[PDB]
Amino acid sequence: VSRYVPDMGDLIWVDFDPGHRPAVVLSPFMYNNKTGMCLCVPCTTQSKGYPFEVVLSGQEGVALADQVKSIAWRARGATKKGTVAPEELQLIKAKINVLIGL
Amino acid sequence: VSRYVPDMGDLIWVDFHRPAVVLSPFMYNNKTGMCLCVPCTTQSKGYPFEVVLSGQERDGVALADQVKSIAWRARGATKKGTVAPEELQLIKAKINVLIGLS
C-alpha cells in the first residue's frame, strides 16, 4: 500500500492527543511529501461568525483562516475527507493574506 | 500596569521557553489575544525555509514554514526585540511561496 499524501486544497482528517479534526491543506504536494509536514487551517461545524471564518459548503462547517498551523501529517495519520472548491481556497488564502501581507 | 502587546515584527519569548517572530498586526493580536508566529532556533541546519536573524553580536534563525497561531496573552509573552524590516519581509515572502497567497 502507498500512503495518501495531502495536497493543496485537500480537506483532511487529523489526529491529536487527546480527538480528531478536519483541516484544509494550504501547502503544495512537493513540500508536503518531502517534509512529511504541511500547512493547514482547522475546521469546525460551529460557525459563530468570526471575522476570519470561511464557510465550507457541504451537503445541507467553517474554516478558521487565522488559525494556520504546521502539522506533521504523516505522523498524525492524516486521511482525505474531501476537497475544497477553488473559490474557497482562494478565500482562505485571501484572509491569511490580510493577517500578514506580501 | 499595561501588559505588553505583540506588534508585527516583534521578537517575543513564549513558554510552553522559545523565541518567535510575530507576523500578525497589533489590532488583531490585541483584539483576539493571539498572534501568528514563526519559531526561532539557535542552529541553522541549512533548510530552505530558514531566515537568519542577524544580531549585533551573534545570529539566529526563524523557521518560516512553521507558522503557528499562539495565544500570547495566555502562554505569556515577553519582548526580546524587533526584527529588521527585511527580515520580516523575507519570512513572509517564503510563506507566500509555500501557500501562494494572493
Partner: peptide
Amino acid sequence: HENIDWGEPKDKEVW
C-alpha cells in the same frame, strides 16, 4: 478567538 490545540508536538514540529 478560541485557540485550537493539536496536543503534543509531533515529528518535525518544533513546537
